[PDB]
Amino acid sequence: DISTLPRVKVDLVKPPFVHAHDQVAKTGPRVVEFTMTIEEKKLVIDREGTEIHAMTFNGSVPGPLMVVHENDYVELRLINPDTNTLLHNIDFHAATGALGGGALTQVNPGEETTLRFKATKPGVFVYHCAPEGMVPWHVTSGMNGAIMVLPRDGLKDEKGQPLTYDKIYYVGEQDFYVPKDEAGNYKKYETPGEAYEDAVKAMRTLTPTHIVFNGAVGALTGDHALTAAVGERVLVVHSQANRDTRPHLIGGHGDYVWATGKFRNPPDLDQETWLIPGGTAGAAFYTFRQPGVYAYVNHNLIEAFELGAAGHFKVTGEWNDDLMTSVVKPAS
Amino acid sequence: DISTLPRVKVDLVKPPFVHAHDQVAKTGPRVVEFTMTIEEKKLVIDREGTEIHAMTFNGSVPGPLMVVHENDYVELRLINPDTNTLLHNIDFHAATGALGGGALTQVNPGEETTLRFKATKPGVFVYHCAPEGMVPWHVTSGMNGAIMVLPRDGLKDEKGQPLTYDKIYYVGEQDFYVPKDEAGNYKKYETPGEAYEDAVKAMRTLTPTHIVFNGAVGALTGDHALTAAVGERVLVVHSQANRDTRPHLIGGHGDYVWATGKFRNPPDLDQETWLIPGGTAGAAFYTFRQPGVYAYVNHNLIEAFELGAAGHFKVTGEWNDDLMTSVVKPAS
Amino acid sequence: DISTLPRVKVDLVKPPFVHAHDQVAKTGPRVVEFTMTIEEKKLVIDREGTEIHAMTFNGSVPGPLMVVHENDYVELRLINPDTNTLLHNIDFHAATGALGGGALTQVNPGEETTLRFKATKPGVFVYHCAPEGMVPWHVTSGMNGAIMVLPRDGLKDEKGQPLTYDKIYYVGEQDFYVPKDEAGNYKKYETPGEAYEDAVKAMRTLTPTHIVFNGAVGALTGDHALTAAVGERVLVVHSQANRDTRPHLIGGHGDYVWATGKFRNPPDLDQETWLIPGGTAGAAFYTFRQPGVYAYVNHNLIEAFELGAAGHFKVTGEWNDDLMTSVVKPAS
Ligand SMILES: O=N[O-]
Ligand SMILES: O=N[O-]
Ligand SMILES: O=N[O-]
Ligand SMILES: O=N[O-]
Ligand SMILES: O=N[O-]
Ligand SMILES: O=N[O-]
Ligand SMILES: O=N[O-]
Ligand SMILES: O=N[O-]
Ligand SMILES: O=N[O-]
Ligand SMILES: O=N[O-]
Ligand SMILES: O=N[O-]
Ligand SMILES: O=N[O-]
Ligand SMILES: O=N[O-]
Ligand SMILES: O=N[O-]
Ligand SMILES: O=N[O-]
Ligand SMILES: O=N[O-]
Ligand SMILES: O=N[O-]
Ligand SMILES: O=N[O-]
Ligand SMILES: [Cu+2]
Ligand SMILES: [Cu+2]
Ligand SMILES: [Cu+2]
Ligand SMILES: [Cu+2]
Ligand SMILES: [Cu+2]
Ligand SMILES: [Cu+2]
Numbered sequence A, B, C: 001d002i003s004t005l006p007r008v009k010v011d012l013v014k015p016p017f018v019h020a021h022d023q024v025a026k027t028g029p030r031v032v033e034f035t036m037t038i039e040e041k042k043l044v045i046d047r048e049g050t051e052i053h054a055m056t057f058n059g060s061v062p063g064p065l066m067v068v069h070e071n072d073y074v075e076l077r078l079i080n081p082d083t084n085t086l087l088h089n090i091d092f093h094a095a096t097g098a099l100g101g102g103a104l105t106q107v108n109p110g111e112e113t114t115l116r117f118k119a120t121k122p123g124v125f126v127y128h129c130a131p132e133g134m135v136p137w138h139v140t141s142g143m144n145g146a147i148m149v150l151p152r153d154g155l156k157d158e159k160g161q162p163l164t165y166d167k168i169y170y171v172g173e174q175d176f177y178v179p180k181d182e183a184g185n186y187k188k189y190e191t192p193g194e195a196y197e198d199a200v201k202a203m204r205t206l207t208p209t210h211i212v213f214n215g216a217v218g219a220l221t222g223d224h225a226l227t228a229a230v231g232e233r234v235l236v237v238h239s240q241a242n243r244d245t246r247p248h249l250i251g252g253h254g255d256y257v258w259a260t261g262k263f264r265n266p267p268d269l270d271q272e273t274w275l276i277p278g279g280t281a282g283a284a285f286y287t288f289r290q291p292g293v294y295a296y297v298n299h300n301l302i303e304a305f306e307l308g309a310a311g312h313f314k315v316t317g318e319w320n321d322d323l324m325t326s327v328v329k330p331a332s
Helices: A098-104 A135-139 A193-204 A301-305 B098-104 B135-139 B193-204 B301-305 C098-104 C135-139 C193-204 C301-305
Strands: A007-009 A031-044 A051-057 A066-069 A073-080 A111-118 A123-128 A144-150 A167-176 A210-213 A226-229 A233-240 A247-250 A254-258 A268-271 A280-287 A292-298 A310-316 A324-331 B007-009 B031-044 B051-057 B066-069 B073-080 B111-118 B123-128 B144-150 B167-176 B210-213 B226-229 B233-240 B247-250 B254-258 B268-271 B280-287 B292-298 B310-316 B324-331 C007-009 C031-044 C051-057 C066-069 C073-080 C111-118 C123-128 C144-150 C167-176 C210-213 C226-229 C233-240 C247-250 C254-258 C268-271 C280-287 C292-298 C310-316 C324-331
Touching: A098 A111, A098 B247, A098 B292, A098 B324, A123 A233, A123 A280, A135 A193, A135 B301, A144 A167, A144 A233, A144 A280, A247 A280, A247 C098, A292 A301, A292 C098, A301 C135, A324 C098, B098 B111, B098 C247, B098 C292, B098 C324, B123 B233, B123 B280, B135 B193, B135 C301, B144 B167, B144 B233, B144 B280, B247 B280, B292 B301, C098 C111, C123 C233, C123 C280, C135 C193, C144 C167, C144 C233, C144 C280, C247 C280, C292 C301
Parallel strands: A007 A031, A031 A073, A066 A144, A167 A233, A226 A310, B007 B031, B031 B073, B066 B144, B167 B233, B226 B310, C007 C031, C031 C073, C066 C144, C167 C233, C226 C310
Antiparallel strands: A031 A051, A073 A111, A111 B324, A123 A144, A167 A210, A233 A280, A247 A292, A254 A268, A254 A280, A292 A310, A324 C111, B031 B051, B073 B111, B111 C324, B123 B144, B167 B210, B233 B280, B247 B292, B254 B268, B254 B280, B292 B310, C031 C051, C073 C111, C123 C144, C167 C210, C233 C280, C247 C292, C254 C268, C254 C280, C292 C310
16 A cells, blocks of 8 residues: 555755665665656767757756665656657656556656656666657667666675675766768757757767767766775766666776676676676676776777767775885886 | 487477477477478568568578477478579587588588587577678578577576476567668669679678568567567567677566576576677566566667667556556646 | 795797696795787788788787786786887786776886786786877777786686686787778878877777787688697687677587686586677687587677688597487488
């Protein structure tokens, strides 16, 4: 009887940060309430000033990470304001039935809807927009995110012992297909609808023009680098709603990795690089052992360093010479 | 002594259906006899009427699924009628030696051959044509299928308890590379041999023009949608002989998945999407919990919705509001 | 106290062969000393005489396989002679900190450096060059290899019983992006630096022109085919520093496979084909059961047979008719 369950309202935060939550459930099953507003907006995606008409959940690419526990109910109020121009909906890979909620959430500009589903399977899962006839266009314009459904007793290692993270980040990786004129210059459009047939043609090449973390080349660098300290346990959730990726922490490892993101399976240990298939979210747990700058990349290094799929961690603490040292510094 | 073993003759059926078989072996080891006839035929692959010269086992793309048990012998009579124009053969990834049988099965038009091999490893496996010097051309013209070698005691879950399916379907996914003229229009040819050098050039782009299930855009829709009922346990075998794919059931999950298709390994649990590498068959087990239409796709959504890699399930039964419900239907 | 540990100097050998080592460690932890010299050289990569300016560790593509045990220290002397023109460095995915050693190993022509790191995680791992601003160019010009860190008690199967190999080979798979003029002819350059902007443009297509094993189309064929005997246990280490691959032994299997190469995980059993993600090394163990020629390929068969990613094994011994036999040889 759902009306007897506690309700809790969560305010979402912008990626790569994640809203507050408990790893081990401190209550019984709850109805967890979320609100997202759809925003179509112009986004500058690279250093050259290339602009696209992005389609977003809550103003960001990716959409925010939602966190619940196994056998909670998720109740999402989805708002499509009349300042938008397109029909949108939402499909949760975490959910069972009705195209993951897609069939029940079709909202025209000026409409809203509220969907409830039971989170029956633990793991990280993609969510994305999926309107009839225009699915890849919405998804590859940025309209995707992820949801984490934790086991009620938190994460476990391959021997079933508790794994507790100190920090959690969400990296959403996005393949964009910006249309090009004859010479290879990127085209510009006044509205999302103008771009449609050119977008379809660009998509059919299967060759992205940009592949980015958190919505732009360089978004997770500088003042926006991810941070940690030596000794901290970090969980990095990574999603790709459309195309395969192969994350790698340069200078580190994935100590425990759920590459296809489903926590009832034992983690893979000591990964250098792992494959997250398009349409999947994965999670990797690492304990930092050395300070300094780390690069977190898609390890197709062209996709990383030429197309944009690279971010940074900045890690503070003590250097350990037993793990690595320069014996003879570069010299003639 | 093989002559003392029972022989059983199996008549194959057209994909996505599968010939009758027992999950748990009701006899000792047998010699299982199959016959396939090679057919080169014109195939219309999309809604626009694009035609290719397909190269098929038994008239279909994919070729039919063959089902045996571990330590059966498979005896295949392979016929290449004199109405064909090309040399063909067959390579079974299930088999050991002689290029998977490829070295022993080279048949010119007007010839036949009979190969026997022992099915020593349990799993789903690709089979495909592989003639010297023209391997990818035959395979990417449709000349591939799969064989399932069941354990003698049937399938097991991650804890070694029996898993029994009520229905089984075979989805063969095919990447086609249709040659294009200068402006991007698909070319037509009178015979398979005319297309050869143009086919090689189209293949070398590594960019398929079409990616389809069961031989055509829309083949597993409408009257040809896959069917099931709420509560039924369905095994979906999926093969890709040349290129990676990432299957996803829209509105469902892979409850138990052997993504690389080999049943001595424990299944992965609760998959949203899984990667089947090119040259592999995989299998996913799901119990339907909600009625309605489901889409089964390659979750590179461009490959799905623009290039053709999407089919439907139509599921009958009772709707469960505890799993999902519309709380507030789309409204102003 | 590292100064009290034994030191052992290893001389590396050319791929696909591997330097001598013990599977089960016969000593306590050691400092293992290696020397590599960087060589920029012209390489002919295909039958047509296409030449590139390759960037190599120790004169080969891939660089040599280094073999140590878990909790050894690796001390690498890296030499960049003044006959080279570029700055190089080395990143070990096996190592922890400083971009895998990349931040500490930047050597101009005429310089050398010595790096030490502790091999804390068992597995096969990529190493590659990674200079600031030119990472994918160096890697896709051939500047990558692998290192194997064995458990001190050798390899184990899925039940923890010893697995011992009789022979070990290293297959390095390389994606090249040779720039093309307007008509599609490959361009030639006097020096590595001349090619830079054309190389970047060719890389951004994400479409390799060649994909090769051991540095050239046909390199592992003929007199350079890999060899084994019926009954031998062979470990094949395979690396791809930039792009996914899907190895397959034509006529065989992967009996035990670590597709992402990390030995604390149980192996996958009975694989037909497995996916090694770009930026990863994997390892597959097979016992040969039949004599003859086998082809070892990337099972995107276009990449294999058109772009170059195919090699051969030649296996001697006795034919077993119980596993496979021609019942009726091809006839009218
Ligand atoms: O700014 N609207 O796409
Ligand atoms: O946009 N309706 O709340
Ligand atoms: O789905 N493309 O990796
Ligand atoms: O092809 N996926 O990077
Ligand atoms: O080790 N980074 O490519
Ligand atoms: O899907 N389990 O990582
Ligand atoms: O119809 N023969 O390709
Ligand atoms: O085609 N010979 O039976
Ligand atoms: O092999 N291409 O996914
Ligand atoms: O690249 N395979 O979809
Ligand atoms: O959830 N289907 O893309
Ligand atoms: O290959 N086992 O899914
Ligand atoms: O031969 N030097 O690139
Ligand atoms: O190149 N210095 O030894
Ligand atoms: O990273 N390309 O398979
Ligand atoms: O896309 N990797 O072959
Ligand atoms: O079975 N070789 O493609
Ligand atoms: O990464 N273990 O194969
Ligand atoms: Cu949308
Ligand atoms: Cu989806
Ligand atoms: Cu054929
Ligand atoms: Cu094959
Ligand atoms: Cu270099
Ligand atoms: Cu790397």
